[PDB]
Amino acid sequence: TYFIDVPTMSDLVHDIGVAPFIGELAAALRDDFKRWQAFDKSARVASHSEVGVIELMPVADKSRYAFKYVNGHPANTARNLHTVMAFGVLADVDSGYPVLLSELTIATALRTAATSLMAAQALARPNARKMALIGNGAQSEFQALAFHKHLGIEEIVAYDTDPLATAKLIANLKEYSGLTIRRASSVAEAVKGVDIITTVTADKAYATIITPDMLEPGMHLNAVGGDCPGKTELHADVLRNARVFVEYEPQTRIEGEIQQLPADFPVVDLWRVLRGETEGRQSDSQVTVFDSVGFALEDYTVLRYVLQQAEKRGMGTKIDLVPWVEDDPKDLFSHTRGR
Amino acid sequence: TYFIDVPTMSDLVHDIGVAPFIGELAAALRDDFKRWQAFDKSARVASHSEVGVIELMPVADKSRYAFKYVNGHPANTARNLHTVMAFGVLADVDSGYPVLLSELTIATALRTAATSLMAAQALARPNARKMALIGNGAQSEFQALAFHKHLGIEEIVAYDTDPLATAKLIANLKEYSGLTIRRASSVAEAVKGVDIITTVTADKAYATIITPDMLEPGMHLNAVGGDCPGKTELHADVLRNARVFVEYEPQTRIEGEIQQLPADFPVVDLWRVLRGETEGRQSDSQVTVFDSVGFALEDYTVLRYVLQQAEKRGMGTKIDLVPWVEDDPKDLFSHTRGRA
Ligand SMILES: NC(=O)c1ccc[n+]([C@@H]2O[C@H](COP(=O)([O-])OP(=O)(O)OC[C@H]3O[C@@H](n4cnc5c(N)ncnc54)[C@H](O)[C@@H]3O)[C@@H](O)[C@H]2O)c1
Ligand SMILES: NC(=O)c1ccc[n+]([C@@H]2O[C@H](COP(=O)([O-])OP(=O)(O)OC[C@H]3O[C@@H](n4cnc5c(N)ncnc54)[C@H](O)[C@@H]3O)[C@@H](O)[C@H]2O)c1
Ligand SMILES: NCCC[C@H](N)C(=O)O
Ligand SMILES: NCCC[C@H](N)C(=O)O
Ligand code: NA
Ligand code: NA
């Protein structure tokens, strides 16, 4: 079993570059989504608590199995901890052997930005150039760069209740001269006249970050922040006024923005759109919404990507997580006599 | 986050002792089973393949969250790999922070033996002295010692289709002079006149290791080997002649021996027996069956036990699995500039 810890992932991402990492991952995600029906899918298992949730996100095909452990505690930042922390494993289906154990906190931000990018490439109007970024925390820089470097976004209007978060975002990306990022005094001000609205706020409760009055013809909404029951960012009527796209419907019906609508509210499966079998955006005036909550297949993709890229660079360290090949695999007792 | 790998767990178990480890764990398991209602329980999630299964087993209470990754591939031994491999994590509920990452292959054998022991103490006749052990692989030595050291079993009659497995079992426990382990040439021969039958065979299919004609009044069956849909060890009629006990009913209805019986077939929750809310064994002549498939609470208990035992010994290695406290927890992007 190989292990990629936080500093090693940092070196890997730094080497590949955040922009290329996101672009290459989006391409890999698109191919895996097209192969949707080849995967053994399931809604992630969630263990809710008073201030957060801890989830396990498994998925697999005929040769590889993958899963991610991840928590979502919005109040963590008040204690100097990340709202989102994660790690995962890529394993061999025919033996059950865990080939890679990897940090996935940094990787989650990367796959989430890549997934949002993939969805936008297929759903947003091709002439998009301005985006509103509501929520300027951990996910924000990644979302900003994904859209700037791969979807032609030149101007971002940002807003966060915490002004220091916005300052951080602007400072982190100032080095990208082709991108202008400016602070707005409110959500309504930030979203005025934008082609794309990305929401990545963290608040474990029902919230109406985006209301019907803010919608303009042709907009694409990248709703990422809400991702579990009782945690939303869009007013229910925003969804009723748009064509809604999802990752894994069974899971999104419960955790996504659509949890606020009748169980029969029509949504479109993103993988069908990517295969060109179902219509995505139907007109230039239409409002499209990517009701994103995160799905195990995305973690499977980033885990496979990380393994391949780390191997090529000889990065990672071996760990004795489980027994390897032994003379007598039925003699587990031999391990009780000491190393 | 601290990490306990295979060799470290080996040293830890060696220092505690297999029998003591099992005994202390059984006591800890009893306490956790008693507060069964305090846990957020769920049936484990499984991913099935043609040769095996890979499962995630989570459980949590108000303070701790735990989960185990584990596979079950009966054909692995032909490739010199273990049929069962596992690892898990114990985390803080109010922050989601993973405190311990630990190997759980060795630990699984220990908690399974402890669970079987705990069940047997409440279900088997208190005067049991002889046990049949069908399947002499990885789990066998642990099951053998649990019963010998904590349930007064002085004699074990063992059988395995692989004669080298039985030889391994006998040689491994020869040092325990108070325990006699003899090889039988068939399952029928091995179970004749025993007080307890422990089955830990590995075969991904519907097997009738134990048939009705083998049953004798007063027996307790510790059915451990079968643990998923389509994988059983007992003939359905064996269950019809017994009082059947389970771990987490919703999960066992799907994966246990009872998957072969009506959805309405009566079963008894082991935790309720331990709480004294319902009976375990009701008569000396009764046949009791612990339909064991494994449940996340057991892994939660062993993870907590391992953490405690490792801490007082200063064992375990720090690993950077996830970020810890930082000046600005909202600046994850700073981690993309390299470790330097
Ligand atoms: N859809 C997915 O795949 C996916 C994966 C990434 C994370 N998540 C979700 O993304 C959200 C953000 O994650 P993060 O790591 O950036 O968290 P974070 O805590 O680092 O940042 C969230 C930011 O939102 C701001 N915020 C909270 N309420 C607000 C409001 N009403 N208006 C404006 N700003 C507000 C906070 O001040 C904070 O800076 C979380 O809710 C998380 O669960 C989803
Ligand atoms: N209930 C639980 O909590 C729990 C936890 C431990 C493992 N499991 C199950 O326990 C079983 C055994 O695990 P292990 O690690 O010892 O595996 P193992 O492969 O090391 O040993 C199993 C043994 O069974 C023998 N066997 C197979 N078919 C047989 C038959 N028809 N008659 C007699 N012997 C036969 C094999 O030759 C082998 O030596 C597996 O099926 C596993 O999934 C259950
Ligand atoms: N707070 C993070 C929760 C998990 C997230 N929805 C994901 O898909 O990773
Ligand atoms: N094939 C998966 C086996 C896992 C075992 N039943 C356990 O409870 O650990
Ligand atoms: Na969302
Ligand atoms: Na069983």
PDB file of N, CA and C in Angstrom, chain A residues 39 53 64 90 105 131 146 154 168 175 181 184 206 212 236 244 270 290 324 327:
ATOM      1  N   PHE A  39     -20.482   1.523 -13.399  1.00  0.00           N
ATOM      2  CA  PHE A  39     -20.179   1.617 -11.971  1.00  0.00           C
ATOM      3  C   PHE A  39     -21.228   1.109 -10.991  1.00  0.00           C
ATOM      4  N   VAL A  53     -21.263  16.508   9.967  1.00  0.00           N
ATOM      5  CA  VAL A  53     -21.577  15.198   9.430  1.00  0.00           C
ATOM      6  C   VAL A  53     -20.282  14.530   8.991  1.00  0.00           C
ATOM      7  N   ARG A  64     -11.592  -1.704 -10.125  1.00  0.00           N
ATOM      8  CA  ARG A  64     -11.166  -0.823  -9.042  1.00  0.00           C
ATOM      9  C   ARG A  64     -12.285  -0.404  -8.099  1.00  0.00           C
ATOM     10  N   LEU A  90      -7.898   3.619  -2.842  1.00  0.00           N
ATOM     11  CA  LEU A  90      -8.167   3.025  -4.146  1.00  0.00           C
ATOM     12  C   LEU A  90      -7.725   1.577  -3.948  1.00  0.00           C
ATOM     13  N   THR A 105      -8.191  16.066   1.187  1.00  0.00           N
ATOM     14  CA  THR A 105      -8.716  17.384   1.537  1.00  0.00           C
ATOM     15  C   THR A 105      -8.403  18.325   0.375  1.00  0.00           C
ATOM     16  N   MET A 131     -18.356  35.965 -13.519  1.00  0.00           N
ATOM     17  CA  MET A 131     -18.912  35.046 -12.537  1.00  0.00           C
ATOM     18  C   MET A 131     -18.973  35.633 -11.136  1.00  0.00           C
ATOM     19  N   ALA A 146     -10.530  27.289 -11.804  1.00  0.00           N
ATOM     20  CA  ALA A 146     -11.099  26.344 -12.756  1.00  0.00           C
ATOM     21  C   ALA A 146     -11.844  27.097 -13.856  1.00  0.00           C
ATOM     22  N   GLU A 154     -13.113  36.020 -17.004  1.00  0.00           N
ATOM     23  CA  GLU A 154     -12.120  37.081 -16.849  1.00  0.00           C
ATOM     24  C   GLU A 154     -12.358  37.954 -15.624  1.00  0.00           C
ATOM     25  N   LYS A 168      -8.422  37.256   1.338  1.00  0.00           N
ATOM     26  CA  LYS A 168      -7.568  36.088   1.136  1.00  0.00           C
ATOM     27  C   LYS A 168      -7.644  35.621  -0.315  1.00  0.00           C
ATOM     28  N   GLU A 175      -1.756  36.959  -8.530  1.00  0.00           N
ATOM     29  CA  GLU A 175      -0.670  36.535  -9.407  1.00  0.00           C
ATOM     30  C   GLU A 175      -1.152  36.132 -10.803  1.00  0.00           C
ATOM     31  N   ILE A 181     -10.642  40.188  -9.728  1.00  0.00           N
ATOM     32  CA  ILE A 181     -11.549  39.751  -8.676  1.00  0.00           C
ATOM     33  C   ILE A 181     -11.835  40.944  -7.780  1.00  0.00           C
ATOM     34  N   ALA A 184     -17.775  42.689  -3.439  1.00  0.00           N
ATOM     35  CA  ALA A 184     -19.092  43.320  -3.524  1.00  0.00           C
ATOM     36  C   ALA A 184     -19.607  43.452  -2.090  1.00  0.00           C
ATOM     37  N   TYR A 206     -30.910  25.632   6.399  1.00  0.00           N
ATOM     38  CA  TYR A 206     -31.591  26.066   5.185  1.00  0.00           C
ATOM     39  C   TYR A 206     -31.280  27.540   4.990  1.00  0.00           C
ATOM     40  N   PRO A 212     -35.172  34.279  -6.213  1.00  0.00           N
ATOM     41  CA  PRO A 212     -35.736  34.476  -7.554  1.00  0.00           C
ATOM     42  C   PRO A 212     -35.475  35.835  -8.207  1.00  0.00           C
ATOM     43  N   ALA A 236     -36.305  27.693  -3.136  1.00  0.00           N
ATOM     44  CA  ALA A 236     -36.993  26.677  -3.932  1.00  0.00           C
ATOM     45  C   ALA A 236     -37.469  27.159  -5.302  1.00  0.00           C
ATOM     46  N   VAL A 244     -32.781  21.830 -14.112  1.00  0.00           N
ATOM     47  CA  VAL A 244     -31.859  21.330 -13.098  1.00  0.00           C
ATOM     48  C   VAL A 244     -31.130  20.037 -13.453  1.00  0.00           C
ATOM     49  N   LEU A 270     -26.650  14.500 -15.407  1.00  0.00           N
ATOM     50  CA  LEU A 270     -25.527  15.080 -16.131  1.00  0.00           C
ATOM     51  C   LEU A 270     -24.826  14.097 -17.062  1.00  0.00           C
ATOM     52  N   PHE A 290     -26.729  23.526 -11.731  1.00  0.00           N
ATOM     53  CA  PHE A 290     -26.034  22.284 -11.450  1.00  0.00           C
ATOM     54  C   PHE A 290     -26.181  22.161  -9.934  1.00  0.00           C
ATOM     55  N   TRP A 324       0.649  -8.380   3.214  1.00  0.00           N
ATOM     56  CA  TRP A 324       0.923  -8.512   1.790  1.00  0.00           C
ATOM     57  C   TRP A 324       0.936 -10.024   1.539  1.00  0.00           C
ATOM     58  N   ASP A 327       4.035 -16.637   3.104  1.00  0.00           N
ATOM     59  CA  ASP A 327       4.180 -18.070   2.869  1.00  0.00           C
ATOM     60  C   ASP A 327       2.904 -18.820   3.239  1.00  0.00           C
TER      61      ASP A 327
END
